[PDB]
Design a protein around this ligand. Structure first.
Ligand code: NAD
Ligand code: NAD
Ligand code: NAD
Ligand code: NAD
Ligand code: ISE
Ligand code: ISE
Ligand code: ISE
Lengths: 366, 366, 362, 366
């Protein structure tokens, strides 16, 4: 059994815990051993280690990564801690499952990437929207020739978790200790999807805005320093075009990662708010010609491991169980885990190049 | 910790196993101890015990049910075995989580109901479409007067798992194993939902059909004895009207449990194939008047235990985690499990009453 | 060129006026001449005759039906006047485009059916939801075997216009309530898909008993919703409902045909989409959204490019054209007063069934 | 009554003819007199004159624009004839209803705009997607504060009429006698809508592609000179951001002019393939929060002239009737029509500006 350490218990932390708990239930083999859970404060770590099924909890993440009973470390902490935690786990000889984005800067991601290549350990980054059966089905349909050659990509990622101007300021909204805004939180997810469909990015031209520039801060206010929304025109290395956007102030949207690939022989379209649906157009005889609604079921990758009947909606959290299985397989020397820290660094360059472009008014080439 | 025995490992067996594994992760407390898994043959039971995380496996279900390390039994076997397994578990002093429908006949269900009442143990039946955040939010909305007084119910449950006439004669067919056809497999679910929204059923007038009358059975052909579809007009105890249907041959549908409640001051509409959407109409100013798409999120019951952010789709399997929690709380005495075997018996009477009506061409009163 | 009389200028009167005005624009041949428009009061009839392009307006409907320049009479008045006006038009030697439902009772419709046969003139009833390109495409798909054998029909017609005074609420002017105003439409579609009805078991309700803003007593005299189970003459099953109090819905005439080899589904609120399921390879399996376009009957007379949405009013231009071709002996219009009589028997049989709590066989 | 001349009888000629015939039926006043129809050859003009209800047909469009019984001229011919015909009509003292785009080039458009200015006759260009009740309702909602201040526009116009590579080459696909491709045929429509919602365009950065570069050309093949698709980032005069695309090779789309306006207090979204629906999000209480589907009815501008009952779908052709009415009222001195040749020249500058941006890889400021 794989020995597991988990750092953090929040949105992604609990998602990781659920994932590691059921990965063998879904996919077979030996259940991973849930060894050490790290979180703060300590009594929360202890309480949650009990209910999560971990052998023990600790408030010291360094203890978790060095434990001799641990083979792999899930890292779900705030972005500013990612570099230090991943580098320590790799230095301790542990495989790493790091939540996105890799870190605050390209410089940090470059160091992480060299550290991963220096260890002989597997890494995967938590781009969970690449794990849905519908997304994986789309990739396989394209690889099967279902839509011919992609000629255009249009993608967006809209949410409104910051749309309320009275939500408080935080150091996450500074460049120095928050890194990127919408591009860092949501943009990187869209890039992960985008490059899986279209291949590498060659050029971006971007624009960005801070829509709510000031927020409540301990009686007065403080300045929001990173972007609430951004958009970019893409030229892929292949020569094909792309449209790209993200926003954390797009009112009414909650997880609207939506993309489409228009090809020479068809079109694929997806919206994460309805993650069980994949829309596929292929030319057909005029009397019946039209897009097909493909409802997620056992014909799509991964789904059969959770349910034998179609239309029993696959959930957001189950994307994480798939992601866990990919890592287990990679550790065991079968499949590859995508993206590792090398593949991840590329994604980091793209989002930071979009930010640089928006700042400078000039395109950025890769 | 509650000691768990699980009988069966198919569609629902694995779903229960996943639910028991993650119930404390989601809702806190102590994780249940996964003690014994029973399945046949023995080889498979030991293999699945290992991957599901159960302390041992056996091919002898009777032994599992009377293991003193077990407190509660999940029963996920075909319908013809429910009665015998449930009565034995209850006789051994074990709580029971029973898959729907209760058994083959109303008489079977009355027996099971009596055994449950005599045992003084908690029961819950696997009507998991009553556990979605959207459904539970709908019930609360109705109670709050969001749509006024209900004036009409229209419900359906379409799937196509038997639509292909080449599918071999399996279990769900005939009177052994399955009992009723679409009414037993799907209709029962629709009733569980319907009565939760509208209250008890006073009268039904029904019709039914067998659309595919024969199937391949190991080189011969065997007759299909139960119904592929059925429809009924309803009068509820309230006086309100209802329409009701189910089908296992409705081509293109996979899990189309869909319902709407029309009221004096609005309308609620839902489709399980998009189980994260609840449609609500309430009167508004003419310029902005229309149905609202309510996307599932932490405002709805149960969701916040799985994810803090709205629009991260809740899945089919997570309904079963919610059901596990309701059973835990009921066992601990902090809540009511619905439906228990008594509540379940009423559901059985409704579906069998519709069968009677379809056979006689006469309405059936309750 | 057909000479046209139009009686009534409301919802349907204006729709007929626009249909007659553009039938030749869309389908060729000679533009119909708009001869006489009848409505009350007279000054309204004069005004609308001018703007609609009719040679005259009159407050006397008999004046419209007796005009020698008229070949065909559109009757778009309240239901209580349909019988008298249609019988007079037919006696006068005019073809008749009659709004649904036929009249107030089965007896009325029987008298009208006999009159139509005696007159040797074409009739058509205004069941305009049978005229969409999507609907006509569906009928043809079913005839071609695209969904195999129909095994179940489920239809509904929800609107909410009564949930918030109309002659529709009286038995002398409207007749039946929801069954008469909306039910008949769903019947026209249902029988066109499934064939004739053999049996109904029905139920009904009045939810709003009195119009609360009328001041004086304003008793709603007929049903607000009804539902039925159907057996078709084929033996196949059906579900049927209608409502004028289903809040949020405005023209939700929605139906599906579940076949042994596929399913077709439609909702009039998105009248340009027809959903077709047929089994396919596991990897691509699912319903197709067929967007209305020139491959569908009638569309190409209005637009050569797919996806430019066909409108409700354009259904009426198609209806007019069907009448025009029937008059010229080039096709049969559906439904004539004989086909329409059967539809009346169905909705009135549903009403009887709901009153008695008993099934009604046809 | 207004005396009408109509030049051309194709897609738009028939659409204009239907509009002229029903404009007084819908909106009152006097029916326009259908005086002269022009098309080639003569047999075709005489036949269509008869069926469209025009007093006469001719093969000589000059005679048509010169007739003293004509007050207004509908020009629905191919793009390379617009300028000559429009200048001739204005010089003959006639009002003009001109199909989009204005001409092949900005220079032609400047010249036509100069002619119009000196004419004292009314002009309107055929931007019919600005005439839907939904679009007009959206514009009014934004003015009323329904979504607060706009903070992002995203628009697209996908069709697939050129997607098949075996469709034969033609001179419209030459820059000389075709002008722009997808920008000229579809892009201009999207600009018309975009500027009406967001205000004037201040800056664009664009890219464009020809996807199918060569098409069967009697015997051999030949070259396509203008673009199949184009995308742009926008800054409006308000400072607000935008995304913009068009394509004539986007498979499965037929008339997918779709746009979205995200504001500080809400979101509006529309797709012309479902032209009777307008989606409006405004913040709501957590239990009922979500987008409203506004179905087109008499509450929206123009609808009541065609039907008194909501939900009876307004069609594409009826947009043209509304456009006819606006011109009618402008001729009567009872309201300015939009867009006239001055307003339209700005739209032409935008689309040609995007083409210039795409060719240079440089932003273009207006
Ligand atoms: N892949 C996705 O879909 C996705 C979704 C949401 C968030 N995220 C990512 O997950 C990470 C955390 O986001 P969240 O929304 O889960 O945040 P959160 O605040 O919900 O959770 C952060 C967790 O880290 C813990 N933590 C903080 N400092 C710590 C320390 N020094 N030692 C141990 N634990 C510590 C917190 O107590 C908490 O349990 C971020 O990188 C974020 O981008 C990814
Ligand atoms: N609530 C729901 O959503 C839902 C969904 C699917 C099925 N079900 C119900 O679950 C039950 C089983 O359905 P399924 O689809 O999981 O069937 P299945 O055929 O997938 O699984 C049946 C399981 O029972 C086992 N079994 C049979 N006889 C046994 C015995 N004597 N001892 C031990 N194990 C035995 C089989 O090996 C198998 O593991 C049925 O009652 C059905 O109505 C419920
Ligand atoms: N096919 C459809 O989709 C559709 C839609 C609406 C109405 N209808 C039907 O069309 C008919 C008319 O309905 P409506 O909604 O247009 O009603 P309406 O009230 O809008 O119009 C009725 C018209 O009849 C006129 N009228 C009344 N008494 C008259 C008389 N003695 N002489 C001349 N004119 C008279 C009224 O002034 C008015 O112009 C009804 O039978 C109704 O069922 C059909
Ligand atoms: N607003 C819209 O939604 C919309 C839709 C389609 C086309 N258009 C525009 O309408 C115009 C026409 O496009 P179409 O699709 O109708 O093309 P088309 O080829 O269908 O029609 C052009 C018409 O002009 C006629 N014509 C050509 N040369 C002529 C001459 N010398 N004299 C008289 N008539 C002549 C043709 O015979 C034909 O009847 C274009 O400018 C196009 O951009 C607008
Ligand atoms: O309980 C069930 C449904 O959930 C499920 O959707 C069906 O496919 C199964 O056959 C049925 O047993
Ligand atoms: O014909 C009719 C329907 O088309 C229409 O939808 C209803 O609103 C009308 O009341 C009815 O008379
Ligand atoms: O104006 C146009 C669009 O409305 C229409 O949708 C396209 O098909 C036409 O090519 C274009 O001329």
């Amino acid at each position: 059994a794989l020995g597991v350490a988990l750092i953090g218990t929040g949105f992604m932390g609990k998602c990781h815990a659920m994932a590691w708990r059921n990965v063998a239930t879904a996919f077979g083999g030996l259940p991973p051993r849930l060894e050490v859970l790290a979180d703060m404060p300590a009594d929360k770590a202890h309480s949650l280690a009990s209910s999560f099924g971990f052998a023990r909890g600790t408030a010291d993440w360094r203890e978790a990564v060095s434990d001799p009973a641990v083979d792999v470390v899930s890292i779900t902490t705030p972005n500013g801690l990612h570099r230090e935690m991943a580098e320590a786990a790799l230095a301790a000889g542990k495989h790493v499952w790091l939540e996105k984005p890799m870190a605050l800067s390209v410089e940090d991601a470059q160091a992480m990437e060299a550290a991963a290549r220096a260890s002989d350990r597997r890494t995967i980054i938590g781009y969970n929207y690449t794990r849905s059966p519908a997304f994986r089905a789309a990739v396989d349909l394209i690889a099967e020739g279902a839509i011919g050659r992609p000629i255009h990509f249009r993608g967006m990622y809209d949410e409104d978790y910051m749309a309320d101007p009275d939500l408080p300021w935080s150091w996450r909204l500074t460049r120095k200790d928050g890194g990127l805004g919408a591009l860092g939180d949501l943009g990187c997810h869209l890039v992960s999807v985008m490059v899986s469909l279209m291949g590498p990015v060659a050029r971006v031209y971007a624009q960005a805005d801070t829509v709510i520039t000031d927020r409540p801060h301990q009686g007065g206010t403080a300045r929001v320093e990173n972007e609430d929304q951004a958009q970019a025109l893409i030229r892929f290395a292949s020569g094909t075009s792309g449209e790209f956007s993200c926003s954390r102030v797009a009112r009414g949207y909650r997880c609207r990662l939506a993309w489409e690939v228009q090809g020479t022989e068809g079109t694929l379209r997806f919206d994460q708010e309805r993650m069980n649906e994949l829309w596929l157009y292929q030319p057909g005889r005029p009397e019946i010609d039209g897009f097909r609604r493909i409802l997620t079921g056992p014909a799509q990758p991964g789904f059969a491991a959770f349910c034998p009947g179609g239309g029993h909606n696959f959930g957001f959290n189950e994307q994480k169980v798939v992601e866990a299985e990919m890592l287990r397989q990679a550790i065991a020397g079968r499949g590859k885990a995508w993206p590792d820290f090398t593949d991840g660094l590329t994604i980091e360059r793209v989002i930071h190049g979009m930010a640089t472009s928006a700042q400078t008014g000039q395109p950025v080439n890769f």
